[PDB]
UniProtKB/Swiss-Prot annotation, chain B:
It is found in: Cytoplasm; Melanosome; Vacuole membrane. This is 14-3-3 protein beta/alpha. Its main location: cytoplasm. GO terms for cellular component: cytoplasm; cytosol; extracellular exosome; focal adhesion; melanosome; membrane; nucleus; perinuclear region of cytoplasm.
Amino acid sequence: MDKSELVQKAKLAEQAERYDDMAAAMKAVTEQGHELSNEERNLLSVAYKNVVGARRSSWRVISSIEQKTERNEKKQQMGKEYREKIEAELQDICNDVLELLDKYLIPNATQPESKVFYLKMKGDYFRYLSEVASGDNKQTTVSNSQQAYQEAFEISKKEMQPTHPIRLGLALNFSVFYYEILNSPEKACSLAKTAFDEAIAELDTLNEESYKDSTLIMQLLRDNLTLWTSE
Amino acid sequence: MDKSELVQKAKLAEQAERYDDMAAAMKAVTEQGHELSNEERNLLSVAYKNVVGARRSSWRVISSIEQKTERNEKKQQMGKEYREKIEAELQDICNDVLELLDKYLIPNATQPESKVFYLKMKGDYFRYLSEVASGDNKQTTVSNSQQAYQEAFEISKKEMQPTHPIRLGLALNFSVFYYEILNSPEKACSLAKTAFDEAIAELDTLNEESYKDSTLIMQLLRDNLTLWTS
């Protein structure tokens, strides 16, 4: 199948709620090595979000059952083996996405908006790995999330205006990552305050017909600053 | 493995909404060659109904998309090929179930309630097959569906109470088969009305354990009779 056929197959698969098929089609599109259109990039992202989310949901269900069962019944052992099967599937999905990002999408992106999108995607899929990782692997996946988000962050600061919704959204998510995952509330507040203040300083340049694209997110930054400051 | 372990896996899979896994576990249970408990029989039925139902839904969606006017020859060919992909999956699933029924479940059944349950399943999965068939295979799967439903129906009238949920569910599925697959409103209405009337003539045969299931199916039979007579 050529790219036109694969994209149509992905759209059909989406309509039919066959997201493994959708992901396979968009994986093949990506592997042709060209920058993705906005439509193609959205199909890829939606496909893998659904595939990984189904496995994450199953994993959470089995883990909850495991925690509730009596610790010497075979139901504890069956849950363990089944949870491990789901974990390996989740890891394989994440590794496929991470390989697409590292081999094709990130290096070939020629616009900063695309590059930020793909680096945030990389951070997200390392976070999915973190949720099922154990031992020293876990700290590693966390660090890899941090690094990818940090890279997206730096690009957004250098190539986008402070009121750009993409830059604001990244500052929101990254400061939250510092607060919740790295347990670093001082730095989280510093990041959010910096992004909020920098956009405040440029409010007078926005158009009256579209300023809410920015101020909505600015409000969330300030909201978090308030919450975290009270603790 | 142990049956208990495979059933535990099937219940975990069901909770996780992983119905391909659930069906595989219950297929393995069935292939041990022993009569299933009511619990195992219901897990098998639920698993494969979920598995086949997902593909039937997808097939309907793609057939609907295909119905639309499409000027691009390549898109139209992709819709046709994707529908055919789903149809081949459906056929594989139905053939697996029909093989389990023919090789294990129907011949080893020692009580009429199970015999009826499995003959009803055989009717259902030949009906599913018929929906994606063509040519003479179409006629053959439709005839096999009808024959299995009819065998089930004769046994159920002899051996089960008219409010038993399996006898009522058989009447529901068989009458809907007449209406939707055979295109015979007369036969569909006759069957559904007989089953509904026979149930309400014997309310003393209801019981606490199955009351809700019985009355739910009686209401579906009633709804269909009202629609088909309109």
